[PDB]
């Protein structure tokens, strides 16, 4: 509220333990952040580079638990950017053209407190100029040091990813919720969901998936506790779709299953998958 201790260009609430420095075209993280802060919003700025120790203060921001840097024109997050935030549970870097994400951005040097990481729409425009894998860069940051052991929720929508990163599933043992919506995934064939006991939610909407084959159906058929989201994929309703349609009619795993429709072939375009039978599915 008015009069609460606050940096210039920010609005603060001591009662809510909240600092908001939003849509202010800031170029650097404010230096005199109040030590009470639990929730810090620094969205809509022009930060460019997040250096090591960008939030490290003396005394530290020991209560800072939620940090939102979405939409702030960050193009580089350096090694150790989030060091000396011992309570940090939720971090949002979405809608930043992150051309340079250090592998040690989340792990620092030398296990992270992070429980939720939101990295939607981080792929820079015209990233193909780079001679490095963007998805690989992000994966390396996720796995470095095995620092992200407590991570329970990961969002990686809208990043032009071409494949489901298998190492993320194998090496983040606490993950409960994974969002890979609005990417360009084409199949799940070489991905194993067999031992993913903790995974409660998997978002694959708006990808380029053609069909799920029996192998994947089998492994999902054996995860009772998952919710999978498959909306707006360009399903190909030919004879290879037969297993998936059979499964879809029986399963409780797929959320919103009534919305799934064929994109191809032409004679099946826009037909609802749950309504199809063996006679519709021919090669
Ligand atoms: C981080 O800050 C952004 C910007 O305020 C929040 O963005 C909004 O998110 C909702 C869905 O959660 C959208 O429907 C709005 O359109 C978003 N606005 C913008 C400008 O992107 C975002 O929710 C915040 N995230 C958290 C976890 O605090
Ligand atoms: C931030 O920058 C943009 C373009 O430079 C401008 O339109 C906008 O008014 C600025 N924001 C504020 C709060 O002045
Ligand atoms: C979906 O992904 C595309 C391309 O990566 C992006 O341009 C578009 O903004 C994304 N959609 C949303 C709703 O963010
Ligand atoms: C789950 O299986 C994969 C691939 O077979 C393996 O790499 C991973 O370590 C297993 N997970 C656990 C927690 O042991
Ligand atoms: C796939 O698995 C199901 C399980 O009921 C089975 O009935 C079906 O014939 C199998 N299809 C294959 C291997 O194409």
Coordinates of C-alpha atoms and ligand atoms in Angstrom, one line a residue:
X1 CA 0.0 0.0 0.0
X2 CA 1.0 3.7 -0.2
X3 CA 4.0 4.4 1.9
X4 CA 5.3 0.8 2.1
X5 CA 9.1 0.6 1.7
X6 CA 9.6 0.2 -2.1
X7 CA 12.3 0.8 -4.8
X8 CA 11.8 3.6 -7.2
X9 CA 9.6 2.6 -10.2
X10 CA 7.9 -0.2 -8.3
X11 CA 4.7 -0.7 -6.2
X12 CA 5.0 -2.6 -3.0
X13 CA 2.9 -4.3 -0.4
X14 CA 4.3 -5.3 2.9
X15 CA 1.1 -7.0 3.9
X16 CA 1.1 -9.2 0.7
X17 CA 4.9 -9.4 0.7
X18 CA 4.8 -8.4 -2.9
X19 CA 6.8 -6.2 -5.1
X20 CA 5.7 -5.3 -8.7
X21 CA 7.9 -3.4 -11.1
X22 CA 5.8 -4.0 -14.1
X23 CA 5.7 -2.4 -17.6
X24 CA 8.3 0.1 -16.6
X25 CA 10.9 -0.5 -19.3
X26 CA 13.4 -1.3 -16.6
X27 CA 16.9 -2.2 -17.9
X28 CA 18.2 -3.7 -14.7
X29 CA 16.8 -5.5 -11.6
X30 CA 16.2 -2.9 -8.9
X31 CA 19.0 -2.9 -6.4
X32 CA 17.2 -2.0 -3.1
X33 CA 14.5 -4.7 -3.1
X34 CA 12.9 -5.0 0.4
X35 CA 14.0 -8.1 2.3
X36 CA 10.3 -9.0 3.1
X37 CA 9.6 -9.8 -0.5
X38 CA 8.0 -13.2 -1.2
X39 CA 6.5 -12.4 -4.7
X40 CA 8.5 -10.4 -7.2
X41 CA 7.1 -9.3 -10.5
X42 CA 9.4 -7.8 -13.1
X43 CA 7.5 -8.3 -16.3
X44 CA 7.2 -6.0 -19.3
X45 CA 10.7 -4.6 -18.9
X46 CA 13.8 -4.3 -21.1
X47 CA 16.3 -6.2 -19.1
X48 CA 18.5 -7.8 -21.9
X49 CA 20.8 -9.8 -19.7
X50 CA 20.3 -11.4 -16.3
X51 CA 23.8 -11.5 -14.7
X52 CA 25.2 -13.9 -12.1
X53 CA 23.8 -13.0 -8.8
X54 CA 21.2 -10.6 -10.2
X55 CA 19.1 -11.1 -7.0
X56 CA 21.9 -11.7 -4.4
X57 CA 21.7 -9.1 -1.7
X58 CA 23.1 -8.6 1.8
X59 CA 21.1 -9.7 3.8
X60 CA 19.7 -12.1 1.2
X61 CA 16.1 -12.1 -0.2
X62 CA 15.6 -15.2 2.0
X63 CA 11.8 -15.2 1.6
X64 CA 11.6 -14.7 -2.2
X65 CA 9.5 -17.6 -3.4
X66 CA 7.9 -16.5 -6.6
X67 CA 9.8 -14.6 -9.3
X68 CA 8.1 -13.5 -12.6
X69 CA 10.3 -12.2 -15.3
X70 CA 8.0 -13.0 -18.2
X71 CA 8.0 -10.6 -21.2
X72 CA 11.1 -8.6 -20.3
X73 CA 13.2 -8.8 -23.4
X74 CA 15.8 -11.1 -21.7
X75 CA 18.1 -12.6 -24.3
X76 CA 20.7 -14.0 -22.0
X77 CA 20.5 -15.6 -18.6
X78 CA 24.0 -16.1 -17.2
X79 CA 25.3 -18.9 -14.9
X80 CA 24.2 -18.4 -11.3
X81 CA 21.5 -15.8 -12.1
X82 CA 19.3 -17.1 -9.3
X83 CA 21.9 -17.7 -6.6
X84 CA 21.3 -16.6 -3.0
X85 CA 17.5 -17.1 -3.3
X86 CA 17.2 -20.0 -0.9
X87 CA 13.3 -20.0 -0.9
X88 CA 12.7 -19.7 -4.6
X89 CA 10.0 -22.1 -5.6
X90 CA 8.4 -20.7 -8.7
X91 CA 10.2 -19.0 -11.6
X92 CA 8.7 -17.7 -14.8
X93 CA 10.9 -16.7 -17.8
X94 CA 8.3 -17.0 -20.5
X95 CA 8.0 -14.8 -23.5
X96 CA 11.7 -13.8 -23.5
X97 CA 13.8 -14.4 -26.6
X98 CA 16.4 -16.5 -24.7
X99 CA 19.1 -17.0 -27.2
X100 CA 21.7 -17.6 -24.5
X101 CA 20.5 -19.7 -21.6
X102 CA 23.5 -20.8 -19.5
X103 CA 23.6 -24.5 -18.6
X104 CA 24.2 -23.3 -15.1
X105 CA 21.4 -20.7 -15.1
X106 CA 19.3 -22.7 -12.5
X107 CA 22.0 -24.8 -10.8
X108 CA 24.6 -22.1 -10.2
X109 CA 28.1 -23.4 -9.3
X110 CA 29.2 -25.9 -6.5
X111 CA 20.1 -28.7 -5.1
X112 CA 17.8 -25.9 -6.3
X113 CA 14.7 -25.0 -4.2
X114 CA 12.7 -24.7 -7.5
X115 CA 9.4 -26.6 -7.7
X116 CA 7.9 -24.9 -10.7
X117 CA 9.7 -23.6 -13.8
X118 CA 7.7 -21.8 -16.6
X119 CA 9.6 -21.5 -19.8
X120 CA 6.9 -20.9 -22.4
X121 CA 7.6 -19.2 -25.7
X122 CA 11.4 -18.7 -25.0
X123 CA 12.6 -19.5 -28.5
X124 CA 13.9 -16.4 -30.1
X125 CA 12.6 -15.3 -33.5
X126 CA 15.0 -16.4 -36.3
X127 CA 16.8 -18.7 -33.8
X128 CA 17.9 -20.8 -36.8
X129 CA 20.8 -18.4 -37.3
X130 CA 22.4 -20.2 -34.3
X131 CA 24.6 -23.2 -34.8
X132 CA 23.3 -24.9 -31.7
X133 CA 20.2 -26.8 -30.8
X134 CA 17.7 -24.5 -28.9
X135 CA 16.0 -27.5 -27.4
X136 CA 19.3 -29.0 -26.5
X137 CA 20.4 -25.7 -24.8
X138 CA 17.2 -25.7 -22.7
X139 CA 17.7 -29.4 -21.8
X140 CA 21.2 -28.8 -20.7
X141 CA 20.1 -26.1 -18.3
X142 CA 17.4 -28.4 -16.9
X143 CA 19.7 -31.3 -16.2
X144 CA 22.9 -29.5 -15.1
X145 CA 24.3 -30.8 -11.8
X146 CA 21.0 -32.7 -11.3
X147 CA 20.1 -29.5 -9.4
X148 CA 16.4 -29.6 -10.2
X149 CA 15.4 -32.6 -8.0
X150 CA 12.4 -31.0 -6.5
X151 CA 11.0 -29.9 -9.8
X152 CA 7.3 -30.8 -9.9
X153 CA 6.1 -28.6 -12.7
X154 CA 7.7 -27.7 -16.0
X155 CA 6.2 -25.7 -18.8
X156 CA 7.9 -25.6 -22.2
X157 CA 5.1 -24.6 -24.6
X158 CA 5.5 -22.7 -27.8
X159 CA 9.2 -23.4 -28.4
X160 CA 9.4 -25.1 -31.8
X161 CA 10.6 -28.2 -30.2
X162 CA 10.8 -31.1 -32.7
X163 CA 10.9 -34.0 -30.1
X164 CA 9.9 -34.9 -26.6
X165 CA 13.2 -34.6 -24.6
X166 CA 13.6 -38.1 -23.3
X167 CA 16.4 -37.1 -20.7
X168 CA 14.1 -34.7 -19.0
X169 CA 11.6 -37.5 -18.2
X170 CA 14.4 -39.8 -17.0
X171 CA 16.4 -37.4 -15.0
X172 CA 13.7 -35.2 -13.3
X173 CA 12.2 -37.8 -10.9
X174 CA 9.8 -35.5 -9.1
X175 CA 8.0 -34.1 -12.2
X176 CA 4.3 -34.3 -11.9
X177 CA 3.2 -31.8 -14.6
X178 CA 4.8 -31.4 -18.1
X179 CA 3.6 -28.9 -20.7
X180 CA 4.8 -29.4 -24.2
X181 CA 1.8 -27.8 -26.0
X182 CA 2.2 -25.8 -29.2
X183 CA 5.5 -27.3 -30.3
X184 CA 6.2 -29.4 -33.5
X185 CA 6.3 -32.9 -32.1
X186 CA 5.5 -35.6 -34.6
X187 CA 5.6 -38.8 -32.7
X188 CA 6.2 -40.4 -29.3
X189 CA 7.6 -43.6 -30.7
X190 CA 11.1 -43.5 -29.1
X191 CA 9.9 -42.1 -25.9
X192 CA 9.3 -44.4 -22.9
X193 CA 6.5 -43.5 -20.4
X194 CA 6.8 -46.9 -18.8
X195 CA 8.2 -45.9 -15.4
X196 CA 6.8 -42.4 -15.1
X197 CA 4.9 -43.1 -11.8
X198 CA 4.8 -39.5 -10.5
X199 CA 3.5 -37.9 -13.9
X200 CA 0.0 -36.6 -13.3
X201 CA -0.4 -34.3 -16.3
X202 CA 1.0 -34.2 -19.8
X203 CA 0.0 -31.5 -22.3
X204 CA 0.6 -32.3 -25.9
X205 CA -2.1 -30.1 -27.5
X206 CA -1.3 -28.2 -30.7
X207 CA 1.6 -30.3 -31.8
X208 CA 2.0 -32.2 -35.2
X209 CA 1.2 -35.7 -33.9
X210 CA -0.2 -38.1 -36.6
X211 CA -1.0 -41.2 -34.5
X212 CA -0.2 -43.0 -31.4
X213 CA 1.0 -46.6 -32.0
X214 CA 0.3 -49.6 -29.8
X215 CA 3.6 -49.3 -28.0
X216 CA 2.9 -45.9 -26.5
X217 CA -0.8 -46.8 -25.9
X218 CA 0.4 -49.8 -24.0
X219 CA 2.6 -47.7 -21.7
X220 CA -0.1 -45.1 -21.1
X221 CA -2.6 -48.0 -20.8
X222 CA -0.5 -48.8 -17.7
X223 CA -0.3 -45.4 -16.1
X224 CA -3.6 -45.1 -14.2
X225 CA -2.9 -41.7 -12.7
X226 CA -2.0 -39.5 -15.7
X227 CA -4.1 -37.0 -17.6
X228 CA -3.0 -36.5 -21.2
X229 CA -4.1 -33.6 -23.3
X230 CA -4.2 -34.2 -27.1
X231 CA -6.4 -31.5 -28.6
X232 CA -5.7 -30.0 -32.0
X233 CA -3.2 -32.5 -33.4
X234 CA -3.5 -33.3 -37.1
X235 CA -4.5 -37.0 -36.7
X236 CA -4.3 -39.3 -39.7
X237 CA -7.3 -41.6 -39.6
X238 CA -6.1 -44.5 -41.8
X239 CA -5.7 -48.2 -40.8
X240 CA -2.7 -47.3 -38.4
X241 CA -5.2 -45.3 -36.3
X242 CA -7.2 -48.4 -35.4
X243 CA -5.5 -49.2 -32.2
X244 CA -5.6 -45.7 -31.0
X245 CA -9.4 -45.3 -31.7
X246 CA -10.1 -48.6 -29.8
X247 CA -8.0 -47.4 -26.9
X248 CA -9.6 -43.9 -26.9
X249 CA -13.1 -45.4 -26.5
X250 CA -12.0 -47.4 -23.4
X251 CA -9.5 -45.0 -21.7
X252 CA -9.9 -42.5 -19.0
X253 CA -6.3 -41.0 -19.5
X254 CA -7.2 -38.6 -22.3
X255 CA -8.8 -35.3 -21.2
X256 CA -11.3 -33.8 -23.5
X257 CA -11.2 -36.9 -25.7
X258 CA -14.4 -35.9 -27.4
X259 CA -12.6 -33.0 -29.1
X260 CA -10.1 -35.0 -31.1
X261 CA -10.7 -34.9 -34.9
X262 CA -9.0 -36.3 -38.0
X263 CA -7.0 -33.9 -40.2
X264 CA -6.4 -36.6 -42.9
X265 CA -7.2 -38.3 -45.2
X266 CA -9.5 -36.0 -47.1
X267 CA -12.6 -38.3 -46.7
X268 CA -12.1 -38.3 -42.9
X269 CA -11.2 -34.6 -42.5
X270 CA -12.9 -33.2 -39.3
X271 CA -14.4 -36.5 -38.3
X272 CA -14.5 -37.0 -34.5
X273 CA -12.2 -39.9 -33.5
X274 CA -14.5 -41.3 -30.9
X275 CA -17.2 -41.8 -33.6
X276 CA -15.0 -43.8 -35.9
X277 CA -15.1 -47.6 -36.4
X278 CA -12.9 -50.1 -38.2
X279 CA -14.8 -49.4 -41.5
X280 CA -13.8 -45.8 -41.4
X281 CA -10.1 -46.7 -40.9
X282 CA -8.6 -48.1 -44.1
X283 CA -5.2 -47.9 -45.9
Ligands
LIG1 C1 3.8 -13.8 -14.8 O1 3.4 -12.6 -15.3 C2 2.6 -12.6 -16.5 C3 2.4 -11.2 -17.0 O2 1.6 -10.5 -16.0 C4 1.3 -13.4 -16.4 O3 0.9 -13.4 -17.7 C5 -0.5 -13.7 -17.9 O4 -0.8 -15.1 -17.8 C6 -2.2 -15.5 -18.0 C7 -2.3 -17.0 -17.8 O5 -1.7 -17.4 -16.6 C8 -2.6 -15.1 -19.4 O6 -3.9 -15.5 -19.8 C9 -2.3 -13.6 -19.7 O7 -2.6 -13.2 -21.0 C10 -0.9 -13.2 -19.3 N1 -0.5 -11.9 -19.6 C11 0.7 -11.6 -20.2 C12 1.0 -10.1 -20.4 O8 1.5 -12.5 -20.6 C13 1.6 -14.8 -15.8 O9 0.5 -15.4 -15.3 C14 2.5 -14.7 -14.6 N2 2.9 -16.0 -14.1 C15 2.9 -16.3 -12.9 C16 3.2 -17.7 -12.6 O10 2.9 -15.4 -12.0
LIG2 C1 7.9 1.4 -22.7 O1 8.5 1.5 -24.0 C2 7.5 1.6 -25.0 C3 8.3 1.8 -26.3 O2 9.6 2.3 -26.0 C4 6.5 2.8 -24.8 O3 5.5 2.7 -25.7 C5 5.9 2.7 -23.4 O4 5.1 3.9 -23.2 C6 7.0 2.6 -22.3 N1 6.3 2.3 -21.0 C7 6.1 3.3 -20.2 C8 5.4 3.0 -18.9 O5 6.4 4.5 -20.4
LIG3 C1 2.3 -21.2 -30.6 O1 3.6 -21.4 -31.2 C2 3.9 -20.4 -32.2 C3 5.2 -20.8 -32.9 O2 6.2 -21.3 -32.0 C4 3.9 -19.0 -31.7 O3 4.2 -18.0 -32.7 C5 2.5 -18.7 -31.1 O4 2.6 -17.4 -30.5 C6 2.3 -19.8 -30.1 N1 0.9 -19.6 -29.5 C7 0.7 -19.1 -28.3 C8 -0.7 -19.1 -28.0 O5 1.6 -18.6 -27.6
LIG4 C1 13.0 -44.7 -15.8 O1 13.4 -45.4 -17.0 C2 14.4 -44.7 -17.8 C3 14.6 -45.4 -19.2 O2 14.5 -46.8 -19.2 C4 15.7 -44.6 -17.0 O3 16.6 -43.9 -17.8 C5 15.3 -43.9 -15.7 O4 16.4 -43.7 -14.8 C6 14.2 -44.5 -14.9 N1 13.8 -43.7 -13.7 C7 14.2 -44.0 -12.4 C8 13.7 -43.0 -11.3 O5 14.9 -44.9 -12.0
LIG5 C1 -2.3 -53.8 -29.4 O1 -2.6 -54.1 -28.0 C2 -4.0 -54.5 -27.8 C3 -4.3 -54.7 -26.3 O2 -5.7 -55.1 -26.2 C4 -4.3 -55.7 -28.7 O3 -5.6 -56.2 -28.6 C5 -4.0 -55.4 -30.2 O4 -4.3 -56.4 -31.1 C6 -2.5 -54.9 -30.4 N1 -2.3 -54.4 -31.7 C7 -1.1 -54.4 -32.5 C8 0.2 -55.1 -31.9 O5 -1.0 -53.9 -33.6

